Amino acid sequence: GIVIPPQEQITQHGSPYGRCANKTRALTVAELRGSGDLQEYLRHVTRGWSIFALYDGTYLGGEYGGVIKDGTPGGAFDLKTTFCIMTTRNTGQPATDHYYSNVTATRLLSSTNSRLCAVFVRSGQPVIGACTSPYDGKYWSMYSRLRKMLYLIYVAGISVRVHVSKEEQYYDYEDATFETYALTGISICNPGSSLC
Amino acid sequence: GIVIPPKALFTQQGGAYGRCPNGTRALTVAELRGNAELQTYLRQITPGWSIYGLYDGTYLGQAYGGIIKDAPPGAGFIYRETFCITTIYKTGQPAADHYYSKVTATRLLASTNSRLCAVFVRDGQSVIGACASPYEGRYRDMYDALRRLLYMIYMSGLAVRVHVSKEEQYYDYEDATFQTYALTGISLCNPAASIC
Amino acid sequence: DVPYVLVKTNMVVTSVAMKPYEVTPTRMLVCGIAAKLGAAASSPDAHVPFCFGKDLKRPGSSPMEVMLRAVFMQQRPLRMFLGPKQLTFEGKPALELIRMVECSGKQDCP
Amino acid sequence: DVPYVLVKTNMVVTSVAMKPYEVTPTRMLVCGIAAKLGAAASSPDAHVPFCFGKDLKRPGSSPMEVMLRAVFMQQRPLRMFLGPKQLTFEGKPALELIRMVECSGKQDCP
Amino acid sequence: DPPATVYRYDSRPPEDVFQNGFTAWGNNDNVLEHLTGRSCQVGSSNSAFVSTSSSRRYTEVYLEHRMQEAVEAERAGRGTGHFIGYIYEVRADNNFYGAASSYFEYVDTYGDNAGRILAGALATYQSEYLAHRRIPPENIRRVTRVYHNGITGETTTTEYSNARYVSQQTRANPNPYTSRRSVASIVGTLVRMAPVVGACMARQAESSEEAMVLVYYESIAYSF
Amino acid sequence: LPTHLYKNFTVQELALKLKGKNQEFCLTAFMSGRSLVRACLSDAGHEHDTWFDTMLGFAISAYALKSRIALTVEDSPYPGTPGDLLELQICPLNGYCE
Ligand SMILES: CC(=O)N[C@H]1[C@H]([C@H](O)[C@H](O)CO)O[C@@](OC[C@H]2O[C@@H](O)[C@H](O)[C@@H](O)[C@H]2O)(C(=O)O)C[C@@H]1O
Ligand SMILES: CC(=O)N[C@H]1[C@H]([C@H](O)[C@H](O)CO)O[C@@](OC[C@H]2O[C@@H](O)[C@H](O)[C@@H](O)[C@H]2O)(C(=O)O)C[C@@H]1O
């Protein structure tokens, strides 16, 4: 199901010591594997008997062909270069209130200088994921208030109805079995209440 | 034995009607009674027959023989002249990490535009007083972070090692049997991690 | 207003409120109702209205604001230095709170 | 510093802390100790310290604080990206955190 | 050293207590569930534990505050304004196990992710001691009645003593009570507000002579 | 602006959302016999106004603490539309607001 980072998400120069720069992240195997556009981009630019680090594995390119060898998390950080995907995609869609009712916030994610996200579930299965960030985003203003509500529903285990804007797509999660967009509102609601 | 506010901290501009100006606090008698120099400074500044308010008692002008007459809290406020002292002492000691471990936070105290404070206590015996203000202090920017945790360790019965600098000595507490300095950092005790 | 500073004791903050500072827009008031522990509902100190100003320009929370919140949820006895100034929480006046220390015991708080 | 970024899984933060950044007064750390489940006390993974930067110029809470708090209070396990830098906390070296993610299951936290 | 005596605040009177002691709501002897309020939760009460506290001071403050609640009630026009509290002195034998040890132990047997932090922070703050199963008349050696007239500000102390009290030299059991891993999905540590008090301890004290507001300790352990 | 006071009510619904550029929050305060009191607060436009954040937090803690509250909502200009909240008070924990 995995959401595959679109081709252009990728950094021009991969990064050192496994330290994918700020606002970006290690590309995965199961993600490179699913990306045709990507495998091609790679082989069409991998010289020598070069191997690359993937969050969960390695990429033997150039003379090696363009092989995706499986691996262990952070294991290939041993190498010289780890391929990095960018996490922020400017979807360029409409600012429409897509809402997902009855969800419960889970799996929090945070990174230096980037966003705070949560995988909103329902019956255990995910549904959507959203994030808030004070540095980057259209709704930088909203972070202060959002973190607050987010925190409560989280520890409290409070069921809610979440509101997102699809104008921004996020690849912050590894092997996203669900999408991830910009958090816009959280509602501790009454079924059918005009407040949701 | 209590800690005695050094003469220097004597506000030349006394508070009016027990309203010590901001950042200053009503001098107690146990203190004035203990500060020889201050007393002495007084004999020479107190004009004949004047009465002075303190937190506890009253101080009569040398015409009356110059006396530290006891009295109940804020009784002496009935009089205009009130003996106040500024709560911050620039120790001169060098900025450095001093810390006490296995303490707990207690005795929250708060002036108006000054420090929030606490008395860290170990096994019943009060150990040290720390303060943190977003208005004055070599660390006035660490307030917002610290205040948040000061608070958590406060509701929870959580034990901590507290780092304190002695470059600033705080006298917000009246008649203390412990010293007060500027809060530099807190660290939840963790035996296994070898903290406490 | 009052002519001098009252100093209550063994007071527990029993209730909090946030209201706009009718006079000034950059500020609002944090109001509460302290009440001497134990005292008969009849006693004068069994219902003491107080408020303090909070500047809406600076971010964060004034020390008093954090203590007020901590001692409220924990209902800890204080030593409120009230007045002399007064604001108007609940229509009726209320004295400005200008300092507060937790009670160590009978020694500092009788 | 350390050579390359370490990625530990099934960690739970058991302490938490704050201190200043020895380099500047415009920043400060937010250390903490994490433990890996299963790891015996002999194992070095049962006591892994860390810290991150917090800018004292941007008032408020970083997404990483906000998370730390939540996952701490809740004893949530986690995938942590530490290194390659080492920072000092409690007089010892500790691996700078650059990103963490709550553990969903063995499928991502082996 | 383990305690010898514990206290227990209760709203049940001596003629009742001295003759029947206390008995746990249920058989769930799971440390974490009780320590976290789950087994004392309204309509989920079954902890095989009788809450006590080795700190009289502790009990005194809870009562001291419960009393004030009365005054504040009558002030609003809810209460008559009177109060009657009891603080029982109990001989803690080796059937009383500490909440601390027991918590910290269930954790270092199941995993740090298996137990919530505040819930242990809380067990320490209550010096709670778990009387497993029941605590019999024979151990209750005294009581302190507390009448208060919030209307006139009159507090009246009076200590009656149990005759059935058997004296023997005992101390609480040093070895923590060991439970099996919980199975329950605990959300957080339920605790009664102002002052903070353990949902068991605070809830077992009430009897027949309104709904108790239990909140999750974590939802407010950090300010909003 | 026919202001009103509703005492000894609880917060049943709490929610933060967007309203044009500005954002707002609202609460349903409720008393068993009585109906629902819906009050909202939005961005004052003037930026620095800690008010929204402050009032918001306060409201969350009220929500959190499960305590009764006292709200002074101004008046709703058109039926259906929640009134603008101007005052918040947390009733003595465990008790009621007198
Ligand atoms: C963007 C969008 O399609 N939002 C929908 C939402 C999502 O599809 C949902 O959160 C994920 O399944 O569905 C909404 O309706 C919920 C409603 O859906 C019915 O089909 C179902 O029979 C009901 O039980 C109930 O779940 C929602 O908000 O959740 C509408 C929303 O517009
Ligand atoms: C400023 C300073 O002296 N800090 C010491 C500190 C104090 O001496 C202590 O607070 C006094 O009670 O001691 C520290 O160590 C912990 C503690 O360990 C005991 O075993 C020992 O007997 C004590 O003297 C004391 O050392 C502390 O953090 O409390 C170390 C610190 O350098």
Output the domain CATH number for residue A94: 2.40.50.110
Half-sphere exposure of B120 (CA within 13 A, CB side): 29
Judge if the upstream peptide bond of residue C49 is cis by omega within 30 degrees of 0. no
CA dist A174 and A119 (Å) reads 12
CA dist D2 and D83 (Å) reads 6
Which residue type is seen at F35?
Answer: S
Kindly tell me the burial class for residue F56, based on how many C-beta atoms sit within 10 Å of its own C-beta (0-12, 13-18, 19 or more).
buried
Helix H or strand E encompassing B31:
helix B29-32
The 10 Å Cβ neighbour count of residue B45 is 11
3-class secondary structure, A128: strand
Strands (E), A133-180: 159-170
Instruction: Kindly determine whether residue B133 and residue C6, on different chains, have CB atoms separated by under 8 Å.
Output: no
What string of DSSP letters covers F62-91?
HHHHT--EEEEE---SSTTSPEEEEEEEE-
Q: To 10 degrees, the CA torsion angle through C72, C76, C81, C84? A: 40
- Judge whether A87 and A63 are in contact, CB under 8 Å: no
E41 to each of C74, E47, E189, E215, how far by Cα in Å?
A: 21, 9, 11, 11
Among the residues of chain A, which ranges form H helices?
29-34, 36-43, 143-156
Instruction: Kindly determine whether residue C102 and residue B111, on different chains, have CB atoms separated by under 8 Å.
Output: no
* Domain membership of residue A39 as a residue range: 1-86
Q: Are residues A189 and A115 in the same domain?
A: yes
Helices E117-126 and D63-73 meet at what angle, rounded to 10? 60
Of A52, A86, A120, at which residue does a domain stop? A86
Q: The sheet that has D19-21: what strands, in order across it?
A: D19-21, D24-29, D53-55
Chain E, residues 66-95, CB within 8 A of chain C, namely 67-68, 71-72, 74-75, 81
CA dist E66 and E70 (Å) reads 7
Q: Would you state the structure tokens that stand for residue B43, as one six-digit string?
A: 């004999």
Q: What is the resolution of this structure in A?
A: 3.5
CA dist B119 and B105 (Å) reads 6
CATH classification code of D1-110:
2.40.50.110
Among the residues of chain C, which ranges form H helices?
63-74
Residue E9 dihedral angles phi and psi, to the nearest 5°: -85, 145
Of the candidates C95, C87, C2, C5, the residue with the CA atom closest to the CA atom of residue C47:
C95
Contacts of F32 (CB under 8 A, 6+ apart): none
CB pairs under 8 A between E and F: 42
- Judge whether C34 and C75 are in contact, CB under 8 Å: no
Longest dimension (CA), chain D: 42
Of the candidates D34, D31, D79, D77, the residue with the CA atom closest to the CA atom of residue B192:
D34
Handedness of CA F56, F58, F59, F60 (dihedral sign): positive
Q: Are residues A58 and A111 in the same domain?
A: no
- Judge whether C16 and C68 are in contact, CB under 8 Å: yes
- In CATH, the architecture of E1-224 is Alpha-Beta Complex (3.90)
E13 touches chain A (CB under 8 A): no
Task: Provide the residue ranges of all domains of chain C, joining segments of one domain with +.
Answer: 1-110
- In CATH, the architecture of F1-98 is Beta Barrel (2.40)
Of A86, A104, A121, at which residue does a domain stop? A86
Ligand nearest the Cα of residue A100 is: 1
Instruction: Kindly determine whether residue E224 and residue F96, on different chains, have CB atoms separated by under 8 Å.
Output: no
D12 touches chain E (CB under 8 A): yes
Q: Would you state the structure tokens that stand for residue A165, as one six-digit string?
A: 């804007």
A168 to each of C88, D34, E148, how far by Cα in Å?
A: 48, 33, 63
Going by the DSSP 8-state scheme, the letter that residue A73 receives in this structure is T
Task: Provide the residue ranges of all domains of chain F, joining segments of one domain with +.
Answer: 1-98
CA E213 to chain centre: 16
CA dist F6 and E206 (Å) reads 30
Q: Are residues A92 and A60 in the same domain?
A: no
Kindly tell me the burial class for residue F46, based on how many C-beta atoms sit within 10 Å of its own C-beta (0-12, 13-18, 19 or more).
exposed
- Judge whether E90 and D53 are in contact, CB under 8 Å: no
CA dist E6 and E90 (Å) reads 5
B187 touches chain D (CB under 8 A): yes
CA dist C46 and C38 (Å) reads 8
Technique used: X-ray
What string of DSSP letters covers chain E?
---SEEEEEESS-HHHHHHH-EE-S-SB--HHHHHTTGGGSTT---BSEEEEES-HHHHHHHHHHHHHHHHHHHHHT---SEEEEEEEEEE--TTEEEHHHHHHHHHHHH-GGGS-HHHHHHHHHHTEEEEESEE-GGGEEEEEEEEEETTTTEEEEE----SSPPP-----BSSPP--PPP-S---S-EEETTTTEEHHHHHHS--------EEEHHHHHS--
Name the domain count of chain A: 2
Q: How far is the CA of B100 from the centre of ligand 2 (A)?
A: 5
Q: Which chains touch F (3 or more CB pairs under 8 A)?
A: A, C, E
CA dist A126 and D77 (Å) reads 19
Q: What domains appear along chain B, each with residue ranges and CATH number?
A: 1-86 (3.10.40.10), 87-196 (2.40.50.110)
